């Protein structure tokens, strides 16, 4: 999603918190958006 | 135009080649074993 590496322990180990926060926050934005997408698909499919 | 509960004045002297360490999210000898500002530091760093 625009991060360094898609592994959280990898980001946290490679970088210091002052930048791990940014890389993480990008991972969080992406994964949260993916969860929202999945939950909305489930909502519509459950309505059907 | 801003009120504050308590304002702190931390005082010390350093070299111009070390001012960058007296700031949030830095690294170095000072920001390691001497004096470290928080990650969410809310204030100004002043020197003359």
Name the resolution in angstroms.
Answer: 3.4
Count other Cβ atoms within 10 Å, centred on residue B22.
20
CA geometry: angle at B23 spanning B22 and B25, to 5°?
Answer: 125
Cα B32 from Cα B34, distance rounded (Å): 6
A3 contact partners, CB below 8 Å, separation of at least 6 = A11, A23, A24, A26, A27, A30
Neighbours of A27 (CB within 10 A): 19
Residues in B 5-44 with any Cβ partner in A closer than 8 A: 24-27, 39
CA distance A38 to A32: 10
Tokens describing residue A35: 């969860």
| Chain B contact set for A18 (CB, 8 A) | 24-26, 39
Burial class (CB in 10 A: 0-12, 13-18, 19+), A6: exposed
C-alpha B18 chain-centroid distance: 11
> Chain A residue closest to B38 (CA)?
A18
Which DSSP helix (H) or strand (E) runs through A36?
helix A17-47
Find where tokens 């489930």 sit.
Answer: A42
Question: Experimental technique used?
Answer: cryo-EM
> How many A-B residue pairs are in contact by the CB < 8 A criterion?
10
**Chain A residues touching residue B24 (CB < 8 angstroms):** 18
């Amino acid at each position: 999603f625009g991060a360094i590496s898609s592994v959280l322990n990898d980001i946290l180990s490679r970088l210091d918190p002052p930048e791990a926060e940014v890389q993480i926050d990008r991972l969080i934005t992406g994964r949260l958006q993916s969860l929202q997408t999945y939950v909305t698909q489930q909502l519509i499919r459950a309505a059907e | 135009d801003l009120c504050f509960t308590n304002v702190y004045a931390d005082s010390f002297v350093i070299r111009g080649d070390e001012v960058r360490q007296i700031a949030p999210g830095q690294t170095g000898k000072i920001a390691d074993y001497n004096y470290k500002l928080p990650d969410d530091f809310t204030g100004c760093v002043i020197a003359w």
